[PDB]
Write a protein that binds this ligand. Structure first.
Ligand SMILES: *[C@@H](C)[C@H]1/C(=C/c2[nH]c(/C=C3N=C(/C=C4/NC(=O)C(CC)=C4C)C(C)=C\3CCC(=O)O)c(CCC(=O)O)c2C)NC(=O)[C@@H]1C
Ligand SMILES: O=S(=O)(O)C[C@@H](O)CNC1CCCCC1
Ligand code: NA
Ligand code: NA
Ligand code: NA
Length: 158
Protein backbone atom coordinates (compact mmCIF):
# COMPACT_ATOMS: atom_id res chain seq x y z
CA UNK A 1 0.00 0.00 0.00
CA UNK A 2 1.86 2.99 1.39
CA UNK A 3 4.12 0.28 2.81
CA UNK A 4 5.56 -0.82 -0.58
CA UNK A 5 5.79 2.88 -1.51
CA UNK A 6 7.90 3.56 1.63
CA UNK A 7 9.93 0.49 0.85
CA UNK A 8 10.53 1.45 -2.77
CA UNK A 9 11.48 5.04 -1.76
CA UNK A 10 13.80 3.99 1.13
CA UNK A 11 15.58 1.37 -1.02
CA UNK A 12 15.92 3.91 -3.88
CA UNK A 13 17.68 6.51 -1.64
CA UNK A 14 19.99 3.83 -0.11
CA UNK A 15 21.22 2.67 -3.52
CA UNK A 16 21.48 6.05 -5.10
CA UNK A 17 23.45 7.39 -2.09
CA UNK A 18 25.26 4.13 -1.16
CA UNK A 19 24.67 4.86 2.49
CA UNK A 20 24.12 2.56 5.43
CA UNK A 21 20.62 3.27 6.50
CA UNK A 22 17.56 5.25 5.22
CA UNK A 23 14.67 6.12 7.47
CA UNK A 24 11.22 7.55 7.03
CA UNK A 25 9.90 9.53 10.05
CA UNK A 26 6.13 10.38 10.37
CA UNK A 27 4.74 13.13 12.61
CA UNK A 28 1.61 12.79 14.71
CA UNK A 29 -0.93 15.66 15.01
CA UNK A 30 0.80 16.81 18.26
CA UNK A 31 4.22 16.75 16.47
CA UNK A 32 5.44 13.68 18.24
CA UNK A 33 6.43 10.99 15.69
CA UNK A 34 8.24 7.74 14.91
CA UNK A 35 10.34 6.04 12.31
CA UNK A 36 7.85 3.97 10.26
CA UNK A 37 10.10 2.47 7.62
CA UNK A 38 13.74 1.65 7.06
CA UNK A 39 16.08 0.42 4.35
CA UNK A 40 19.33 -0.84 5.83
CA UNK A 41 22.56 -2.48 4.57
CA UNK A 42 23.17 -6.16 5.52
CA UNK A 43 26.09 -5.11 7.75
CA UNK A 44 23.81 -3.45 10.36
CA UNK A 45 21.00 -4.44 12.68
CA UNK A 46 17.50 -3.09 11.95
CA UNK A 47 16.64 0.06 13.86
CA UNK A 48 13.87 -1.70 15.77
CA UNK A 49 16.35 -4.20 17.30
CA UNK A 50 18.69 -1.46 18.32
CA UNK A 51 15.77 0.41 19.88
CA UNK A 52 14.86 -2.68 22.00
CA UNK A 53 18.35 -3.06 23.50
CA UNK A 54 20.32 0.17 23.28
CA UNK A 55 18.77 2.94 25.27
CA UNK A 56 18.81 6.60 24.13
CA UNK A 57 18.52 10.02 25.56
CA UNK A 58 14.99 11.24 25.43
CA UNK A 59 14.47 13.54 22.35
CA UNK A 60 11.38 15.77 22.34
CA UNK A 61 12.92 18.67 20.34
CA UNK A 62 10.82 18.33 17.19
CA UNK A 63 7.68 17.86 19.11
CA UNK A 64 8.29 20.90 21.33
CA UNK A 65 9.09 23.00 18.24
CA UNK A 66 6.30 21.63 16.01
CA UNK A 67 8.69 20.22 13.37
CA UNK A 68 11.64 22.54 13.97
CA UNK A 69 13.50 23.73 10.86
CA UNK A 70 11.58 21.29 8.65
CA UNK A 71 8.46 23.30 9.20
CA UNK A 72 10.09 26.14 7.16
CA UNK A 73 11.21 23.72 4.44
CA UNK A 74 14.75 23.65 5.73
CA UNK A 75 17.00 20.48 5.71
CA UNK A 76 19.96 19.21 7.71
CA UNK A 77 23.17 18.22 5.88
CA UNK A 78 25.91 16.97 8.12
CA UNK A 79 29.29 15.81 6.82
CA UNK A 80 30.57 14.87 10.29
CA UNK A 81 28.44 14.65 13.43
CA UNK A 82 31.66 14.98 15.52
CA UNK A 83 32.36 18.53 14.25
CA UNK A 84 28.82 19.73 13.87
CA UNK A 85 28.39 21.21 17.41
CA UNK A 86 25.38 19.16 18.50
CA UNK A 87 24.27 18.98 22.10
CA UNK A 88 25.95 16.17 24.04
CA UNK A 89 22.72 14.15 24.23
CA UNK A 90 22.09 14.40 20.47
CA UNK A 91 25.67 13.41 19.60
CA UNK A 92 25.57 10.59 22.12
CA UNK A 93 22.35 9.34 20.43
CA UNK A 94 23.88 9.55 16.97
CA UNK A 95 27.01 7.83 18.24
CA UNK A 96 24.92 4.99 19.78
CA UNK A 97 23.76 4.18 16.29
CA UNK A 98 27.18 4.62 14.81
CA UNK A 99 25.94 7.48 12.63
CA UNK A 100 28.87 9.62 11.46
CA UNK A 101 27.23 11.76 8.65
CA UNK A 102 23.67 12.21 7.58
CA UNK A 103 21.09 14.11 5.56
CA UNK A 104 17.54 14.81 6.73
CA UNK A 105 14.92 16.52 4.54
CA UNK A 106 11.24 17.39 5.03
CA UNK A 107 8.38 15.45 3.50
CA UNK A 108 5.34 17.67 2.68
CA UNK A 109 1.92 16.22 1.96
CA UNK A 110 -0.24 18.92 0.43
CA UNK A 111 1.04 22.03 2.03
CA UNK A 112 1.61 20.46 5.53
CA UNK A 113 4.86 18.90 7.02
CA UNK A 114 4.12 15.16 7.22
CA UNK A 115 7.51 13.57 8.09
CA UNK A 116 11.21 13.41 7.30
CA UNK A 117 13.45 11.40 5.05
CA UNK A 118 16.85 10.62 6.45
CA UNK A 119 19.99 9.12 4.96
CA UNK A 120 22.81 7.92 7.21
CA UNK A 121 26.42 6.97 6.88
CA UNK A 122 28.16 5.04 9.58
CA UNK A 123 31.78 5.07 10.56
CA UNK A 124 33.33 7.73 8.38
CA UNK A 125 32.58 11.37 7.54
CA UNK A 126 31.09 12.32 4.20
CA UNK A 127 31.44 15.12 1.64
CA UNK A 128 27.90 15.45 0.58
CA UNK A 129 27.33 16.89 -2.90
CA UNK A 130 24.70 19.23 -4.09
CA UNK A 131 23.26 16.77 -6.57
CA UNK A 132 22.85 14.17 -3.85
CA UNK A 133 20.91 16.69 -1.73
CA UNK A 134 18.86 17.71 -4.75
CA UNK A 135 17.99 14.12 -5.62
CA UNK A 136 17.02 13.48 -1.98
CA UNK A 137 14.67 16.48 -2.10
CA UNK A 138 13.16 15.15 -5.36
CA UNK A 139 12.55 11.79 -3.86
CA UNK A 140 11.05 13.39 -0.74
CA UNK A 141 8.75 15.49 -2.91
CA UNK A 142 7.55 12.40 -4.81
CA UNK A 143 6.93 10.60 -1.56
CA UNK A 144 4.78 13.47 -0.38
CA UNK A 145 2.74 13.29 -3.58
CA UNK A 146 2.25 9.58 -3.24
CA UNK A 147 1.03 9.95 0.26
CA UNK A 148 -1.13 12.94 -0.72
CA UNK A 149 -2.81 10.92 -3.51
CA UNK A 150 -3.26 7.87 -1.30
CA UNK A 151 -5.11 10.22 1.15
CA UNK A 152 -7.24 11.57 -1.71
CA UNK A 153 -8.15 8.01 -2.80
CA UNK A 154 -9.07 7.12 0.80
CA UNK A 155 -11.30 10.25 0.91
CA UNK A 156 -13.01 8.68 -2.15
CA UNK A 157 -14.98 6.26 0.18
CA UNK A 158 -18.60 5.78 -1.17
C1 LIG B 1 19.57 16.02 23.25
C2 LIG B 1 18.93 14.68 22.83
C3 LIG B 1 18.55 17.17 23.12
C4 LIG B 1 17.78 17.20 21.80
C5 LIG B 1 18.47 17.60 20.73
C6 LIG B 1 18.03 17.81 19.32
N1 LIG B 1 17.53 16.77 18.60
C7 LIG B 1 17.09 17.30 17.41
C8 LIG B 1 16.58 16.57 16.26
C9 LIG B 1 16.23 15.17 16.07
N2 LIG B 1 16.22 14.25 17.11
C10 LIG B 1 15.80 13.08 16.57
C11 LIG B 1 15.66 11.66 17.12
C12 LIG B 1 16.48 10.52 16.75
N3 LIG B 1 16.01 9.38 17.46
C13 LIG B 1 16.82 8.41 16.94
O1 LIG B 1 16.72 7.16 17.28
C14 LIG B 1 17.83 8.83 15.91
C15 LIG B 1 18.82 8.00 15.19
C16 LIG B 1 18.31 7.63 13.81
C17 LIG B 1 17.60 10.28 15.74
C18 LIG B 1 18.42 11.15 14.78
C19 LIG B 1 15.57 13.23 15.08
C20 LIG B 1 15.12 12.28 14.03
C21 LIG B 1 15.86 14.63 14.74
C22 LIG B 1 15.80 15.32 13.37
C23 LIG B 1 17.16 15.06 12.71
C24 LIG B 1 18.37 15.33 13.61
O2 LIG B 1 19.13 14.41 14.11
O3 LIG B 1 18.63 16.52 13.85
C25 LIG B 1 17.40 18.70 17.30
C26 LIG B 1 17.14 19.65 16.16
C27 LIG B 1 18.48 19.79 15.45
C28 LIG B 1 18.44 20.88 14.33
O4 LIG B 1 19.31 21.77 14.38
O5 LIG B 1 17.53 20.83 13.51
C29 LIG B 1 17.95 19.07 18.55
C30 LIG B 1 18.35 20.42 18.98
N4 LIG B 1 16.54 16.74 21.93
C31 LIG B 1 16.21 16.73 23.27
O6 LIG B 1 15.10 16.61 23.67
C32 LIG B 1 17.42 17.03 24.11
C33 LIG B 1 17.11 18.36 24.88
O1 LIG C 1 18.54 25.97 14.40
S1 LIG C 1 17.36 25.68 15.26
O2 LIG C 1 16.78 26.85 15.88
O3 LIG C 1 16.33 25.04 14.48
C1 LIG C 1 17.71 24.29 16.21
C2 LIG C 1 18.79 24.37 17.21
O4 LIG C 1 18.60 23.36 18.22
C3 LIG C 1 20.16 24.27 16.60
N1 LIG C 1 20.74 22.91 16.35
C4 LIG C 1 22.19 23.00 16.13
C5 LIG C 1 22.33 23.75 14.78
C6 LIG C 1 23.73 23.66 14.20
C7 LIG C 1 24.31 22.25 14.18
C8 LIG C 1 24.28 21.67 15.58
C9 LIG C 1 22.84 21.62 16.07
NA1 NA D 1 14.82 5.92 18.27
NA1 NA E 1 21.63 19.22 19.10
NA1 NA F 1 17.70 11.93 11.10
Amino acid sequence: SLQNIFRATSDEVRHLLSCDRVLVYRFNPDWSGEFIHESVAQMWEPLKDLQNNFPLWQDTYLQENEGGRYRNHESLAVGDVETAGFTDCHLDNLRRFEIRAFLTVPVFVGEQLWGLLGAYQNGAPRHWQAREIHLLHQIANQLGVAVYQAQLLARFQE
